[PDB]
From Swiss-Prot:
Originating organism: Lassa virus (strain Mouse/Sierra Leone/Josiah/1976) (LASV)
Location(s) in or outside the cell: Virion; Host cytoplasm
Descriptive protein name: Nucleoprotein
Residues forming coiled coils: none
Assembly: Homomultimerizes to form the nucleocapsid. Binds to viral genomic RNA. Interacts with glycoprotein G2. Interacts with protein Z; this interaction probably directs the encapsidated genome to budding sites. Interacts with protein L; this interaction does not interfere with Z-L interaction. Interacts with host IKBKE (via Protein kinase domain); the interaction inhibits IKBKE kinase activity.
Length: 203
């Protein structure tokens, strides 16, 4: 499938707010060859890109749900196909992107022809990166309700589910001494994130 020419031009419209000279975090949930949640975050401006994708490898998705994102696969059946490839194509040229663990972000961008994107690796330890975790969830819990399952960590203690958006927000908080003052606003309209079908009309 893919996005129509009108959607691609609308996506091109929404991508203009991103300041290409501002700090931009990027995190994904799921493997880079088969991602299911993608998030970009500019803390200075408050603009964030957030959308989902149906997985190709169902066997690996179940493992990632048990030990990371805890997403029910049935909640990803109405996503817009091809949005990931289109958003990556529409990112500004030679944009610099910040991430905790730059390996998987680099693989996703190179697999989509965007070798021009510069990446900076913030190497924070596992428990250091998620110090603001409870504070980020309490402030922006209404921005993602997709994480419904119980996530555990092998040696089987239950943990908070990993969200691509909340990760970008809490990672920037760890290197900035706290949450940014800017209020978040979504770059992408909801009609492009979820392929919504016409419901039955009550006559
Ligand atoms: Zn999420």
């Amino acid at each position: 499938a893919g996005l129509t020419y009108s959607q691609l031009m609308t996506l091109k419209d929404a991508m203009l707010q991103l300041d290409p000279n501002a700090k931009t975090w990027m995190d994904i949930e799921g493997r880079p060859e088969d991602p299911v949640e993608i998030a970009l975050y500019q803390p200075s401006s408050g603009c964030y890109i957030h959308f989902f994708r149906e997985p190709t490898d169902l066997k690996q998705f179940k493992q990632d749900a048990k030990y990371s994102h805890g997403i029910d696969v049935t909640d990803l059946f109405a996503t817009q196909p091809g949005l990931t490839s289109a958003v990556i194509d529409a990112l500004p040229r030679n944009m610099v992107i910040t991430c905790q663990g730059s390996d998987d972000i680099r693989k996703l961008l190179e697999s989509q022809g965007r070798k021009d994107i510069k990446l900076i690796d913030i190497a924070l330890s596992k428990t250091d990166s998620r110090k603001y975790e409870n504070a980020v969830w309490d402030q922006y819990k209404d921005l993602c309700h997709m994480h419904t399952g119980v996530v555990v960590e092998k040696k089987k203690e239950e943990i908070t589910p990993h969200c691509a958006l909340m990760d970008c927000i809490m990672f920037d908080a760890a290197v900035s001494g706290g949450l940014n003052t800017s209020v978040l606003r979504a770059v992408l309209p909801r009609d492009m994130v979820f392929r919504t079908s016409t419901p039955r009309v009550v006559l």
